[PDB]
Amino acid sequence: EFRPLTLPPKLSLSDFNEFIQDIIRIVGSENVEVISVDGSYMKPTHTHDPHHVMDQDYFLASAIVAPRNVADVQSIVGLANKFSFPLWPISIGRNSGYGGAAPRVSGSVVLDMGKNMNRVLEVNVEGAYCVVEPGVTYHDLHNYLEANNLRDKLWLDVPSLGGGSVLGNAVERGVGYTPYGDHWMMHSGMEVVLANGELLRTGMGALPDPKRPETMGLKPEDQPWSKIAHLFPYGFGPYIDGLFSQSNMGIVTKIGIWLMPNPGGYQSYLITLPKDGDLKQAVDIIRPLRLGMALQNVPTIRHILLDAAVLGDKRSYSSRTEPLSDEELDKIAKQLNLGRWNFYGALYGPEPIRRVLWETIKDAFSAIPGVKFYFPEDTPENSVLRVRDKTMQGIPTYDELKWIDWLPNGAHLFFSPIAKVSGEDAMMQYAVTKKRCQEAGLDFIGEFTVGMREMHHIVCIVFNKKDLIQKRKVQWLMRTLIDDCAANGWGEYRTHLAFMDQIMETYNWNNSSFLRFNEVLKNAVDPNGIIAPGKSGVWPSQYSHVTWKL
Amino acid sequence: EFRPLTLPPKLSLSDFNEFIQDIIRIVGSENVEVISVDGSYMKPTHTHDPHHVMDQDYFLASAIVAPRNVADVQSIVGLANKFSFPLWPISIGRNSGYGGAAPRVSGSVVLDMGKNMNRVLEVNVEGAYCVVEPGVTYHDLHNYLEANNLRDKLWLDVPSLGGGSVLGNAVERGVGYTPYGDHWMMHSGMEVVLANGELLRTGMGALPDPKRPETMGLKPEDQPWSKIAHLFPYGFGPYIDGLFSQSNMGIVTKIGIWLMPNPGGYQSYLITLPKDGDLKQAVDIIRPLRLGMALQNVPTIRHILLDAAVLGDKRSYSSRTEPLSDEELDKIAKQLNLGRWNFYGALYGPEPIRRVLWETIKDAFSAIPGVKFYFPEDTPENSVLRVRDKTMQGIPTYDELKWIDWLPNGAHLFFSPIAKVSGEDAMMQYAVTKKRCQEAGLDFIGEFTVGMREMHHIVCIVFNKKDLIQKRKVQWLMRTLIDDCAANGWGEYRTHLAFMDQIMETYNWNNSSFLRFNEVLKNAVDPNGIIAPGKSGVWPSQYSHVTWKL
Ligand SMILES: *Cc1cc2c(cc1C)nc1c(=O)[nH]c(=O)nc-1n2C[C@H](O)[C@H](O)[C@H](O)COP(=O)(O)OP(=O)(O)OC[C@H]1O[C@@H](n2cnc3c(N)ncnc32)[C@H](O)[C@@H]1O
Ligand SMILES: *Cc1cc2c(cc1C)nc1c(=O)[nH]c(=O)nc-1n2C[C@H](O)[C@H](O)[C@H](O)COP(=O)(O)OP(=O)(O)OC[C@H]1O[C@@H](n2cnc3c(N)ncnc32)[C@H](O)[C@@H]1O
Numbered sequence A, B: 001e002f003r004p005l006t007l008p009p010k011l012s013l014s015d016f017n018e019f020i021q022d023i024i025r026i027v028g029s030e031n032v033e034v035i036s037v038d039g040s041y042m043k044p045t046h047t048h049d050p051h052h053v054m055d056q057d058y059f060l061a062s063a064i065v066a067p068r069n070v071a072d073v074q075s076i077v078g079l080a081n082k083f084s085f086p087l088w089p090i091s092i093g094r095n096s097g098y099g100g101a102a103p104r105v106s107g108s109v110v111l112d113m114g115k116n117m118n119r120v121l122e123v124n125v126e127g128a129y130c131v132v133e134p135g136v137t138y139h140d141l142h143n144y145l146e147a148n149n150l151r152d153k154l155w156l157d158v159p160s161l162g163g164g165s166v167l168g169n170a171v172e173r174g175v176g177y178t179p180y181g182d183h184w185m186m187h188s189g190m191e192v193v194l195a196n197g198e199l200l201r202t203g204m205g206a207l208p209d210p211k212r213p214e215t216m217g218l219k220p221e222d223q224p225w226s227k228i229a230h231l232f233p234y235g236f237g238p239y240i241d242g243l244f245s246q247s248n249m250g251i252v253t254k255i256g257i258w259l260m261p262n263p264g265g266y267q268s269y270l271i272t273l274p275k276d277g278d279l280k281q282a283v284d285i286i287r288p289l290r291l292g293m294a295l296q297n298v299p300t301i302r303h304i305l306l307d308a309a310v311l312g313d314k315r316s317y318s319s320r321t322e323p324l325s326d327e328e329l330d331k332i333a334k335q336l337n338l339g340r341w342n343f344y345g346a347l348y349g350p351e352p353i354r355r356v357l358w359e360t361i362k363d364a365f366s367a368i369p370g371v372k373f374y375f376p377e378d379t380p381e382n383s384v385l386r387v388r389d390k391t392m393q394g395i396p397t398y399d400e401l402k403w404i405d406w407l408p409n410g411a412h413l414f415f416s417p418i419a420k421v422s423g424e425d426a427m428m429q430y431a432v433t434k435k436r437c438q439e440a441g442l443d444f445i446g447e448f449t450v451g452m453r454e455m456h457h458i459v460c461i462v463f464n465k466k467d468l469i470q471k472r473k474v475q476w477l478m479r480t481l482i483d484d485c486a487a488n489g490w491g492e493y494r495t496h497l498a499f500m501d502q503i504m505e506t507y508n509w510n511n512s513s514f515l516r517f518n519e520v521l522k523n524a525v526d527p528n529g530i531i532a533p534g535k536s537g538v539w540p541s542q543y544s545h546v547t548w549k550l
């Protein structure tokens, strides 16, 4: 196609068309869409941000391209280098709340890796691992295990929803709820296409499988891996895998994620905490239980409106437009049989072991007045525990999508600071976020997901995307929370396209030495700067800061 | 001082003298040694390799320098860049079997960071972590916990011996035997001096502690860290921490390791395996127990000569010079009440939990004929279980040093391939390593340390350092094993100064793309190539390969 809405920096219309006709040459017209609609969670947009905070055409592509295979990524990269054309690599593009598929720089080509590079490449039982392409979603992998009856030997680890990409998510450092919840840390053996176009495989993925007749003459992308590849991440020398998570260092084509074997015994559960300030005693209780391993998985401490919103929109609870009051929160708590804060967990293993742990657990949370213990069966048909019962055993759902519909044309945006595992700190962080949320006229809706020694605080800001005024209120809230949290010693672990620079300016110890050194490595390997300029505040030398930061 | 035995590449004697007098200016004469003795494990040498395979002066320093503090490292770096002088940073220099303190390039300055930068900087109980300078040894941190009665709240994780440096070892990716065995993976928040000279702190060590009166005006090296620094390793953006493990990317000044909490119940144990081929069944049994978590720590499967060597030199078992026979191995096994292969482990936790796990463990290992279960008390006064009982609970020892004295002027050299957690593979690797060992006139002595999905096979070659003929035999064996293992799909995880280029040539998938990409990053940040040129086969652009590879 011919005249796009936005073009990339310094490129001419004649240049765009020579490039696109070249890309059409390589991947067929069926795999290249020019842009001369927000969609859903089932048919994800690939051109812009669907949960749009800035204007709707603010972060938008010039064309979308779907490589049919690894060589196609090599061809497109050389062309991007020929013309200086910035690319934006997505796997599924389901990063809503962080931008979705949109490119940080308008005019880029979005690289739809997933549409054709789809395959579960290997599921190895003795190694208890799998090897996946960008396009394998969580659901997809789950159906792969079920079609080969692997469900009885190996389990998955899913975030809250089922449409994400196993790899896309893992390269973002996302989180899940089984004992294998730190997705990125369960990776081992990635394959990458660099900016120059060369294929690289990490760790022991660099040790080649020995020559044998059946594998002779296969292109590099299509060769097998040597035995240790997906069993030990480190290989030899500098361990470079992290330069490929939350970065613009290369295009990820394949990855190995470790799978947890069926533990032969599972029991999900729910502890309800009666009052808004029981968060302080609860987090003090979780600390030693987490650190001592009575708490096997990644427990979540959810805020009442988070469960409530799954169950119904705000109009269904009050016709009010201002933030619901404290007492209306207590009111909803009791209608659902939930507390003010809800703790979701699970016990894994033989009966004998679960029993002892569940006893210490119950017994510890008993020192909190009015506390109450529930297993799925003890709760309503539509409950959140019934849904998390599947979530905490690797089975993918879609139910939690409904909280996004809290307000009319609801869109979410995550504010994700990290806090210690201490009641005092947790309260202090919540205090600070609640106050700003009220000032902007928004209900506070969050959850803490409990790591070993840290807590991911996901403040879930939901808002009406057709409201100009509130869209500006959310932009004012987001930046204010970034800054206040920084003045209290907390940083965010992940963000949306528009807060990237700001959030990265926050990590400025010693005069910004952490971004400086990121800038050096990025120019070294990406001299024409075509691989995702902007990602995480890291800009190649030819994109001036003054012109592009936000 | 004025005339060193060896000078660094392209430096003149007048250049060396100006440099050294400038360094004496900064750190005092008491801290700079010029080299115009192999020492021990108690007074480690810092000029060369004590467990020397090549000629003794082959890997040697021009001078040794001990910075008094971080600023001194900054000052020495700037002079190393003024003059183009290679530096080799050590913490303790106890890397014997891998080179000790020696520099890959002769004529370098050895940077003794340890001699003055010694402090346990913080031990935080609620966060269950610690902060350490190069110079804190394992023993040292152990004595720090005892002096403040922290031994009843927090435990350490030690490798076989106690003199290593908590940080030096962790940047090497070394291993230990409690559940916190993977050293490197327990780190969180490093401070680095880069080649350019700028200070950098990683992860959330990049988010600065908020301004307060008590901390104003402190130099960067001396500032506190923000609260999450040592509790979540990832920060935001690209996760650069691995570029500082097993690499020449910068000089490590401080690090944060995570400390296991006293688990309130401990029991160490020994399972003896009667026959040389029971290694196949044993590893098949270990697989599901490890992956299912009944095996809590990092279990070790040791070879009979490894325990026997701790107990006595070879002259004490046979006056023979040739490798001991199969039947003499069985002979020794029975004198010591050990098997042919010995499995060491530990159970952590309340009584109720240990009990169920110990039952599954025993019961699984019962399908191996003649098997026999021992707790420490059940064994002699001088046994290895008695020693490992302290090892598997974080208490530092020095007993296992005796195996180096297997032969007269015994020195060790490690050959460290990685194998699957499968009996078949294990046998195959052992097969291949036993035959080559027999061809060189050497006893096979090794152990496998059991990771979640992989095994570190440490073939412990010991040899007489004054023997010219055997010294060449050890050089012939080392390279042959490198190549054979690579022809069988296995790579080594760590190595000595002389095999470094060889081993890295082994990880050549896709025409050596993994070292190419390491070369790009290294030149980007180290333009005058003065931080440890050669480490892990990674050479800066001005050290021609043809002149320096081995
Ligand atoms: C709306 C929502 C989101 C959500 C969630 C609950 C709700 C209601 N719960 C989450 C959870 O529990 N854990 C979690 O990690 N995320 C959660 N989210 C957010 C989001 O839905 C998921 O994270 C989702 O899996 C992320 O999207 P997907 O995996 O589909 O992503 P993507 O945009 O394609 O990729 C994300 C970004 O990563 C980089 N990327 C992706 N692929 C590549 C390749 N091949 N190479 C290089 N970089 C790549 C890009 O920067 C991209 O934009
Ligand atoms: C002889 C021996 C060795 C041994 C062992 C048993 C015996 C009998 N058991 C070990 C075990 O169970 N686990 C293990 O990991 N190692 C074991 N070893 C080997 C060795 O003794 C230990 O690994 C020892 O702790 C390593 O030495 P140390 O920690 O004292 O040494 P280092 O030379 O100072 O540092 C090693 C290398 O790391 C890089 N390095 C070190 N410090 C820095 C800083 N500050 N910045 C950048 N790089 C650094 C260098 O490459 C250096 O040479």
Ligand SMILES: Oc1ccc(C(F)(F)F)cc1
Binding pocket: A160, A174, A175, A414, A416, A447, A449, A456, A458, A494
């Ligand atoms: O990065 C994240 C992690 C968790 C969540 C959720 F759904 F649990 F809140 C959202 C975004």
